[PDB]
């Protein structure tokens, strides 16, 4: 969800990045099927 | 003024200059020649090539400031002050009565901050006040 932003470095020049979130395989709750899982939740 | 004989006030109104309409007019280059009398025309805004609109700086500012009534408070009748916001004073961050002129009346000077000489003259007449 979102996270697009600049990546200023040293000279403070900007180039766009992504701010990627953590994710992993999971057993799930709603129906026993493998699912992406947000790390901060577990 | 009879609407077909309107006549505008003497010396008001004068025909605008129209550049670029002929040569006898005195304006066909229009104005300038060869230079940056080009359309963009930017002089620069106020500059040469050596920035003298800057040498060093000195500054700061906090909250303050009053509103001056001089001992020409000799206009109004007798007694009272601050009320004269209905006679002769307008916007007041706070109202100080200064000296200057020479007082000619006996009256209460109910005001915030009295200038010293003014206090001696107002008190030499009769009344004084504070806050």
């Amino acid at each position: 969800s979102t996270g697009n932003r600049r990546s200023h470095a040293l000279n403070s020049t900007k180039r766009r990045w992504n701010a990627n979130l953590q994710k992993v395989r999971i057993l799930v709750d709603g129906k026993p099927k493998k699912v992406w899982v947000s790390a901060r939740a577990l | 003024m009879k609407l077909h004989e309107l006549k505008p006030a003497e010396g008001s109104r004068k025909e605008r200059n129209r550049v670029g309409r002929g040569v006898a007019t005195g304006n066909g280059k229009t104005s300038g020649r060869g230079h940056k009398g080009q359309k963009a025309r930017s002089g620069g805004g106020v500059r040469p090539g050596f920035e003298g609109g800057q040498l060093p700086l000195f500054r700061r500012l906090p909250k303050r400031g009053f509103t001056n009534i001089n001992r020409k408070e000799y206009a109004i009748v007798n007694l009272d002050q601050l009320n004269k916001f209905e006679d002769g004073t307008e916007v007041t961050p706070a109202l100080l009565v200064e000296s200057g002129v020479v007082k000619n009346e006996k009256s209460g000077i109910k005001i915030l901050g009295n200038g010293s000489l003014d206090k001696k003259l107002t008190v030499k007449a009769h009344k004084f006040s504070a806050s």
């Binding site: - | 003024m1 009879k2 505008p8 008001s12």
Partner: protein, 199 residues
Amino acid sequence: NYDVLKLDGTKSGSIELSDAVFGIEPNNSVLFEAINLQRASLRQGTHAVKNRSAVSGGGRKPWKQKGTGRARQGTIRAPQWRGGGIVFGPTPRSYAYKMPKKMRRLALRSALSFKAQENGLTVVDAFNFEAPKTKEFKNVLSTLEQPKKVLVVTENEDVNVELSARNIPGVQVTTAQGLNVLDITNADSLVITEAAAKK
């Protein structure tokens, strides 16, 4: 300065109208600027014309810049082209402007007193119908163009409307112009007393 009020033929009484409204002895320069102002305001500014950014053409370079033997060009819609964009035409805009209040009041007295130094008749009257008796009610002498000034809105009196030269407003009305396109006026009586009251 007693004005000799009268009613529909024969003389009636008299009234002393204030001399610093009806006897200002007009200041002309203000009256001019007022007239020009009011005309300024009646103008709506609906003229507009399409500059090159606006024209329903494109902006390919019509031909490559060098080696053609033609002049260089930018768009087929640049201003020298037939069909091209207009440079600096009219655009929509405000036209009307403000004037200081006292000047407006000075102007009003000036127009009225101009009307007094020549002629401007008075009459207490009015009726409850709708007739071209008003034309027959210019048995009161009264000339070609004029306004009927009146105390407040008086529909019927106002329906002396479609009689060519006549015009007929209130007194809290009272334009600088209508007043002196006018040639003759007739503040009635109540009204005359109010314009007298609203200096």
